């Protein structure tokens, strides 16, 4: 029979389940497209900007190069955090304490920068994990209704009640359809986690080494001023 | 069957399985209600007190902002812990040590309050994991009595097996109903644990650095 | 017929199965390339670690770990070391440098892991989920088989005897992409993990060497 | 029957014997590591009673001298004397220790990598052996479906030897699965016990040489 | 009736007996530990000197875990004699706690992975029982053309009994492990609170040494 003749015939609970699977898939596609486009904007842009800033070599030329990145420079906002600590370094004669106070502040924001895009992830990943189990309940619901329907009188002949079991298995089908690429998309987002967090941690350690060598100058090269 | 029919269509042991799954479901729905509305209160308080405490340019200013939170602010008791170690390290010229000493104190206390609210994890997670296996027991019981019904008939058709099939599928479906929202709202609440407790740690590092910068002032700027 | 056994069920199931087999082949290429590459690395760092545990000075380390071929990772570690030695110029603070330089190499060691960390999702996760892909293809095939049973009702014995076996065969090709691929990153952990030790040993050692070389300042060149 | 051993297929029998021969290889792994950490727990028990109160690094050496040449404590004393010979001229006692310690601790991971091998066999094979058996099932039931599409009665003993060899594949997957992850959990308790106690010994040596370098940094200071 | 499937089922039931015995012993011990720790935690919360730490922990009896940690602390008080290094000790002594307390947790570390993985793989050994049973059933009907599955229906039922007792052993072992690891977290947290309090006590006392010699 036709797919509408198989589908509107099917149980409306299973229908609502499968349409919920497809709508959560649409949410997942939207989130995937957004993270993909934004992350490669980050990757290409801040990769060339990383080539710029890895030999900025002054920590004020790091400011000057990151000044013209456009407004979306996360790194210039971390440089603003560094200048904030310099404003918190006012009166702090101990260079060595500052640095410790500096250190985690970067990895206070940066993984938060990671948790800038940390939202939505557990959602769609666990959707991709547990959606076939949702479709499995759809199968149990449909096959349960069919095998109550052939047990009340009680009849036989699975072959005349089998389309109800097929419409039940359609739930597991759409659960698997939603299940595979959502786990795939969180795995490639974990590769994004690796690339972005590692690379921007390289940038963080770059700024740490820039301002760390500058405080080493102020503590040891300016020890003989 | 009928309404009272499908009440009686499942056997009384299968009925006990049904009621056990649905009662565990409903009591952890109440656990869900508690966690949801309490974390709701906590995150709206998080939003307002985060806006109130980001401006805390002094830790004494932060104490002032901790005052007009109500007495039941977690951050108020964290500043109480801060003043506690100000009075316990009262006399510690080792400004370099104290804060580290304080930090891991901090890295328990309201985190333990967060580890308060992780008490209900086993309910959602593990009961949603084992509920299909309870459904597996329901299948074993129903298909064993279905085999008894075949041995009473030796007809080997759908009629001689099918009421036990329906009872086993009823147990399976109620196992899945007790399974899926438990584990998925478990993962929801653990993600809430992550986000909320992380931002609480952000506030904790804010207070740590307020005291850290003020004791750097008292160490090096009040040296001078 | 054998080509009849190819052509029983459907061609979408064929497409899914050959997609499994082609992903298998490109990950075979991944396995083969990383295997021969890490043997080159293992034999190399084997004799290099033999010669560089006896590199009793960092200048002897620059002598020995130069070549070894021009493409040693340890050469780049020596390059980063001399980089921050040239960036240690002006600051007499021995105590800072090395600490930072430690994690420089360790972040470079992260880079070393990030040398080969990219592409493992293919191997491991495809080996995990390929029977789930074949499970879905089997769901597809059995639902079409139930359409065929609905075409010839009142008798479901040999309406679909072979064709379901093709859909299960889809699971089989999921099964034929299941076992070794997970195992591959298991392979591509273990002595690679020792590599995470081994190379992560020696530059650390060189760090230690440089640490003791800074003692050759801080305990020896301290008083002129 | 002997024909019922090679019944209707031999490549599924080939994966039966592949599962149980990999089992025998990992049994050799099991009993080897079993008698290994048996010797280690007896030895390190005795050596623990010895070097728990080795009052000096000289007592850490001499009370380790009766161990035989095959003690790991001997290697750790080699590491300690190595850093002593490498810190010759190092008036900085205060550094050395940190620089020494994680040497030990990398060696400690090498201690784990004393038997880092064999483990993935037991653990991962004991996980996925019924999936090998599952492919055996799919193979057997596809061949039985060839048979019952050749007969087209599709009932009832015409599927039975294919069902039997599919369940035989399942059963050999299960026999390979359960004791292998069992033995890796046993070996993870070996990891815990040996790692922890040898780390106690490592911390003991670090405390000993830490207090001795403190006595050198405060040798003519506290009097 | 059958014996090998019965051997699997009694292996399940005897592993359940070992599991329940461990659960009973652990749970009674944990109540003793936790209500005693509730009272003694209220006691030692204001143990404000190391001497007050010993004196408040004195009436605990010898069954106090923390009294042996006071012994640990006094041990490296006595072993650090001779050198003026206050400054190293503490971290080391912290790590002594990072040994000893873990050992305390590893004091109960033995049967945990046992019954956890038992509750994990109990349906898998029940699965092996039903595989054994249904395979013997199809050996029983391995003739040319059979019908009437009632000749193999109670054999598959007795095979499913293995899955049944597999589930019966599967549930509370994983359940009780999750409960036990949860209060492993809780009890180790309170014990780490105690350890941190002792470290802060001795840390403030060494700071009063280094500051009372300074002031």
């Amino acid at each position: 029979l036709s797919v509408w003749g198989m589908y509107q015939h099917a149980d409306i609970v299973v229908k609502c389940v499968m349409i919920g699977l497809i709508l959560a898939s649409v949410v997942t596609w939207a989130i995937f497209f957004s993270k993909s486009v934004e992350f490669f904007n980050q990757k290409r842009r801040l990769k060339r900007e990383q080539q710029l800033l890895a030999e900025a070599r002054s920590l004020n030329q790091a400011n000057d190069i990151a000044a013209d990145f456009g407004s979306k420079s996360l790194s210039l906002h971390l440089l603003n955090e560094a200048q904030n600590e310099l404003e918190l370094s006012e009166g702090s004669d101990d260079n060595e304490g500052i640095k410790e106070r500096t250190s985690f502040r970067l990895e206070r924001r940066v993984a938060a920068v990671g948790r800038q895009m940390g939202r939505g992830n557990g959602y769609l990943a666990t959707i991709g994990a547990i959606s076939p189990f949702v479709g499995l309940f759809g199968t149990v619901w449909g096959i349960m209704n069919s095998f109550i329907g052939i047990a009340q009188t009680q009849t036989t002949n699975l072959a005349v009640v089998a389309p109800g079991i097929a419409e039940a298995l359609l739930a597991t089908a759409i659960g698997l359809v939603a299940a595979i690429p959502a786990v795939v998309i969180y795995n490639v987002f974990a590769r994004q986690i690796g690339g972005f967090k590692a690379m921007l941690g390289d940038v963080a350690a770059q700024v740490l080494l820039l301002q760390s060598r500058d405080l080493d100058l102020e503590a040891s090269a300016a020890a003989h001023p | 069957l009928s309404v009272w029919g499908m009440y009686q269509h499942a056997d009384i042991v299968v009925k006990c399985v049904m009621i056990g799954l649905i009662l565990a479901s409903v009591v952890t729905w109440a656990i869900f209600f508690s966690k949801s509305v309490e974390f709701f209160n906590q995150k709206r308080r998080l939003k307002r007190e985060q806006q109130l405490l980001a401006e805390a340019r002094s830790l004494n200013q932060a104490n002032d902002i901790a005052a007009d939170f109500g007495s039941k602010s977690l951050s108020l008791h964290l500043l109480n812990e801060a003043q506690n170690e100000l009075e316990l390290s009262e006399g510690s010229d080792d400004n370099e040590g104290i804060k580290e000493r304080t930090s891991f104190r901090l890295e328990r206390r309201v985190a333990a309050v967060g580890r308060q609210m992780g008490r209900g994890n086993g309910y959602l997670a593990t009961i949603g994991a084992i509920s299909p296996f309870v459904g597996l027991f329901g299948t074993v019981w129903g298909i064993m009595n279905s085999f008894i019904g075949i041995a009473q008939t030796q007809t080997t058709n759908l009629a001689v097996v099918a009421p036990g099939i329906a009872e086993a599928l009823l147990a399976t479906a109620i196992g899945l109903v007790a399974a899926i929202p438990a584990v998925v709202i478990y993962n929801v609440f653990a993600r809430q644990i992550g986000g909320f407790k992380a931002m609480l740690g952000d506030v904790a590092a804010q207070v740590l650095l307020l005291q850290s910068r003020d004791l750097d002032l008292e160490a090096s700027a009040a040296a001078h | 017929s054998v080509w009849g056994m190819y052509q029983h069920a459907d061609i979408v199931v064929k497409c899914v199965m050959i997609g499994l087999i082609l992903a298998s082949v490109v990950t075979w290429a991944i396995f083969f390339s990383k295997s021969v590459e890490f043997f080159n690395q293992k034999r190399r760092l084997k004799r290099e670690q033999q010669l560089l545990a006896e590199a009793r000075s960092l200048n002897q380390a620059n002598d020995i770990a130069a070549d070894f071929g021009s493409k040693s990772l340890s050469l780049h570690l020596l390059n980063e070391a001399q980089n921050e030695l040239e960036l240690s110029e002006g600051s007499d603070d021995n105590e800072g440098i090395k600490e930072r330089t430690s994690f420089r190499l360790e972040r470079r060691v992260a880079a070393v892991g990030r040398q080969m960390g990219r592409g493992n999702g293919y191997l491991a996760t495809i080996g995990a989920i390929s029977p789930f892909v074949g499970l879905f293809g089997t769901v597809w095939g059995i639902m079409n088989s139930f359409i065929g049973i609905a075409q010839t009702q009142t008798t479901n014995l040999a309406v679909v005897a072979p064709g379901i076996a093709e859909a299960l065969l889809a699971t089989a090709i999921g099964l034929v992409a299941a076992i070794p691929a997970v195992v591959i990153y298991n392979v591509f952990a273990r002595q690679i993990g020792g590599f995470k030790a081994m190379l992560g040993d020696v530059a650390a050692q060189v760090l230690l060497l440089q640490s003791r070389d800074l003692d050759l300042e801080a305990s020896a060149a301290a008083h002129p | 029957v002997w024909g019922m051993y090679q019944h209707a297929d031999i490549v599924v029998k080939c994966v039966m014997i592949g599962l149980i021969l990999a089992s025998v290889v990992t049994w050799a792994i099991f009993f080897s590591k079993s008698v290994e950490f048996f010797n280690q727990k007896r030895r390190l028990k005795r050596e623990q009673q010895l070097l728990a109160e080795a009052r000096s690094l000289n007592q850490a050496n001499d009370i380790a001298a009766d161990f035989g040449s095959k003690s790991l404590s001997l290697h750790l004393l080699n590491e300690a004397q190595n850093e002593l010979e490498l810190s010759e001229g190092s008036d900085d006692n205060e550094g050395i220790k940190e620089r020494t310690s994680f040497r030990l601790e990398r060696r400690v991971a090498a201690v784990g990598r004393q038997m880092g091998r064999g483990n993935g066999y037991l653990a991962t094979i004991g996980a996925i052996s019924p999936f090998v058996g599952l492919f055996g099932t799919v193979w057997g039931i596809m061949n039985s479906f060839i048979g019952i599409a050749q007969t087209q009665t599709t009932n009832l003993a015409v599927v039975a030897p294919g069902i039997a060899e599919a369940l035989l594949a399942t059963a050999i997957g299960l026999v390979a699965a359960i004791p292998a992850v069992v033995i890796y959990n046993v070996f993870a308790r070996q990891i815990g016990g040996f790692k922890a106690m040898l780390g106690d010994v490592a911390a003991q040596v670090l405390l000993l040489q830490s207090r001795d370098l403190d006595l050198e940094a405060s040798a003519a200071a506290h009097p | 009736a059958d014996i090998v499937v019965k051997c699997v089922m009694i292996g399940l039931i005897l592993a359940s007996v070992v599991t329940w015995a461990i659960f009973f012993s652990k749970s009674v011990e944990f109540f003793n530990q936790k209500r005693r720790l509730k009272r003694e935690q209220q006691l030692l919360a204001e143990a404000r000197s190391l001497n007050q730490a010993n004196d408040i922990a004195a009436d605990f009896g010898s069954k106090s875990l923390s009294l042996h940690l006071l012994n640990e602390a006094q041990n490296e008080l006595e072993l650090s004699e001779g050198s003026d290094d206050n400054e190293g000790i503490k971290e080391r002594t912290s790590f002594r706690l990072e040994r000893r307390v873990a050992a305390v947790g590893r004091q109960m570390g033995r049967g945990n992975g046992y019954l956890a993985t038992i509750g994990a793989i109990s349906p898998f050994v029940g699965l092996f029982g039903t595989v054994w049973g249904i395979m013997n059933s199809f050996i029983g009907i391995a003739q040319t053309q059979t019908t009437n599955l009632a000749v193999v229906a109670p054999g598959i039922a007795e095979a499913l009994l293995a899955t049944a007792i597999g589930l019966v052993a599967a549930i509370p072992a994983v359940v009780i492990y999750n409960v036990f690891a949860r209060q492993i977290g809780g009890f180790k947290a309170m014990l780490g609170d105690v350890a941190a309090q002792v470290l802060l006590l001795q840390s403030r006392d060494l700071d009063l040494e280094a500051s009372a010699a300074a002031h």
Partner: peptide, 22 residues
């Protein structure tokens, strides 16, 4: 984690059930 595919055996039991009325 990868446990519930005893449900595949449950599908095999459904196949066992459709073999029955024949």
């Amino acid at each position: 984690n990868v446990t519930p595919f005893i449900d595949v055996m449950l599908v095999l039991l459904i196949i066992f059930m459709v073999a029955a009325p024949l």
